[PDB]
Amino acid sequence: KYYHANSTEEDSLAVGTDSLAMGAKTIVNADAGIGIGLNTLVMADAINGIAIGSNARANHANSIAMGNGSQTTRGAQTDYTAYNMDTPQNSVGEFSVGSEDGQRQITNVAAGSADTDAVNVGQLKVTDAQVSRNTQSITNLNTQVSNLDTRVTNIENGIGDIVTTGSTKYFKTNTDGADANAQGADSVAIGSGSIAAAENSVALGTNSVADEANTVSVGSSTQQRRITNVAAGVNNTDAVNVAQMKQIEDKIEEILSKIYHIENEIARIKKLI
Amino acid sequence: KYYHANSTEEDSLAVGTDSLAMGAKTIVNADAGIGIGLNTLVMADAINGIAIGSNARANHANSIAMGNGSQTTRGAQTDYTAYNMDTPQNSVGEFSVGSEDGQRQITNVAAGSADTDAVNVGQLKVTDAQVSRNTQSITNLNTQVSNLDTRVTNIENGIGDIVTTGSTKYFKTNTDGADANAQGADSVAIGSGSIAAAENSVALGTNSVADEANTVSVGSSTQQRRITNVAAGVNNTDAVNVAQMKQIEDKIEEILSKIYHIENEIARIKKLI
Amino acid sequence: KYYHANSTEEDSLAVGTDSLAMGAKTIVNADAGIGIGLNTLVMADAINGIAIGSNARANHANSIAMGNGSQTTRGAQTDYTAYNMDTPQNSVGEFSVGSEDGQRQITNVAAGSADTDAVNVGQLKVTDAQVSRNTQSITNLNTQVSNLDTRVTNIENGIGDIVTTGSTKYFKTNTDGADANAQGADSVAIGSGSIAAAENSVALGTNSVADEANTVSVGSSTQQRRITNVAAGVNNTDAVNVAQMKQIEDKIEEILSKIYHIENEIARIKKLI
C-alpha cells in the first residue's frame, strides 16, 4: 500500500540478519544488506552491502553497486596504492556504477573543493590549459636556443680565427709559440716570444727583445735583423741607407788616391835633391 | 509494516513489467524500473532505469538519476569521444547526481587506483604541483636565455668592429685592400697587401714585401720608405741617422780642403825650383 | 508482500511530511525525506535529504549520503571557491559516499565527455604523460643552456679581453691611453696616441707621429727613438748600423794621421831650403 511491484515472478528473499530486500528474485543473503530489483544478489555473507538494479551484484565487504549487471570489484582497501600518489591510502568501501565488462559516465557533478572530492572534466581542463601554455613556452625555448647555439657557433668560427692565430686580416703572424709580451709601460710587442721590457719601447718581430727605454728592437743579441727597402734619409733624424754610405766610402777612396799621388810627388822631390 | 510513508497524496504506480516503485505520485512506466519518492518519473519505456528523489527523472535507457529535480541526460553512449582520450570510448549508461540547471559535489572519495576510477581533488593537486614546478623552470630559462642573447649581442657588436676593419683600438689601418699575408715561418705582416715571404721576417706597411730571412721590410723595390724620428745610434748594432752621417760628411769636406792646400804647396815648391 | 525485512528491532519512523522511510530504527524526521536501513538518521535540519545504508546520516539541507556510516558533510554550497576555478561556483547539493572519518573508491567509471562529468584515473594519466614529456624537455634545456653559458663565458674570457686591452696574444700593448689613429690613406698606426697622418705611412710606437708620405716613424719631434739589433746593411736600400760607421770613422782617423805626417814633411822641406 504505497509500494507497488508488477510481477508474476518468484518471491523476494531478505535472508540476512537485520537485512532489507525488495523486488522479484532478489536474494539478499548478507547481514544488514540492501538490494533492490530483478535478482540483485548479495554474494558471500560479505557484509552490509547494497545492489540497486536489474541483475545487480554486491560482492565485496562493505561496498555498493548501482544498476544493470553492476558488481562490486574490490570494496574496502587498506594500506593501498593510488595513482599519482606516493604514500598509501585507506578506504572504507567501493562504490560501483558499472562493471569489469562495462562502465558508466557520472554526469552533473559540481567542481570539487576539498581534497577527497570527485574532480570534474572542467577542473582538469584548467590544468591542461597550463600544460599547453607551458608546452608552447618550451617549443619557443628549444627554438630560441637552437638559434643561440647557431650565433655562438659562428662567433667560434669567425673569431676563432682571431683568438687562435692571434691575428687579424691586417696584422698577421704565422707562428704558434710564446705569447707576445709588452712588459714595460707604454710598450709594444709584436710576435711570438717578443719582449718589450723597457719604458716606451717596441719589440718588432718573433723573439725580438727591446730592453732599453725609447728604442725599437728589430731583434736581439742572439739574433739581429737587417732592415730593408729604406729610402735615403733626408732629415737629420732620418735613417741613412747603404747607398748613402757607399757615397762616403767612394769619396774616401778618391782621397786615398789623391794622397798616393801626393806622396809620390813628395818622394819625387826629396830624392830629386 | 516496516516501510512507513506519511502522506495524503495520490497512489504510487509501478506500471512497468517486473518494476518496483515506492512513494507518492511516483510513476514508474519502464520495465524493470526503480523509482523512489515524490513524483519520481521513469520517462519513456526507457528501460531498467532509476530515480531516487523529489521530482526525480529517469529519461535515458539503462541510466540512473539521484535527488531533487535530477534527470538522466544521455545514458548509454557507444563509441564516443571521451575527454582527453584518443581512441573511442564505450559506455553502458549514465549516472546523474543532478541536472542541466543544478549540480552536486561528490564528497568523501578515496583516491582512484585503476584507470576507470573517479579521481579526487587531491590526485589533481599532485599533478598541479609539477605544472607549477615546471612553470617556474620556464620563467627561469626564459630569463636565462634572454641574458644569453644580450651577451651574444654584445660580442656580435664589439667583435664585428674588428672582423671588418682588421684593426683594434691600438693597431689600426685605414684601408680596404688585400688581407695581409704572413707566409714564411715565424713571420709578421702588417697592413693590406703586405707579404712576409721569408723565414722569421717582418713586412711593415701597406704593400711591403720582406723576401729575405731575418729582415724587416719597410717597403719594396716598387716603393721604398724613409724611416723617420730616429735617435743617434750608440751601440754597434744600432741604426745610424742622417745627422750622424752629416758629421762624417763634414770631416771629409775638411779633409778635401786640407788636401787642396797641400796640393798648392806642392805645386808652389815644384815650380819654385 | 514483496518487501521483506528480517528483524526483531524497533519500528521504522517516517516522521516528516510527505516522507518515506524503510528499515529498523530508521528515523526520518525531515520533510520529503528518504532513508533506508539500520539506525539511519535524517535529523539536523535535513530538508528533503536521503541516506541509504547501515547507520546512514543525512545532515545537510538538500543533500544525499550512501552506505555504511556515511554522512552529508556540507550540502548545498553557493558561491564557494572550488579548487582551480578562479570563478566562484554554485551547488544544489552534496552527495557523500563516506565520511569525514572514512571514504570510498568509485570504481567502474566511463571516461568523462562533457565538462561536469566525473573524470577517471585514465583521463588524468593522459595529462600526466605530457607533464612528464615536458619535465624532460626542461631538464634538457637547463642542460643545453648550462652549456651555452659555458661556451659564451669562454668567448668573453678570450676575445673581449682584446677589445679591452687592444691586444692579441701576438700584438700586445701595455697601455691605457688614447686609441691609435691611422688617419692617412693606407696608413698604419701602432700603439696609444700614435698618429699616421700621411699617405701610406706607419706610426710605430706609443705617441709616434708619421707626418710625411712614405715614411715609418719610430717616434716624433718631442721624443725620438733609437733602433736596435740591426744587422749590417748589404744592399743599397738596406739600413746601415753603427759598427758599419765606426769602421769608416776609423779610416778617416787613419787618413788625418797620414795628412799630418805629410804636412810635416812638406814643412820639413820648405824650411830646409
Ligand SMILES: [Cl-]
Ligand atoms: Cl607543464
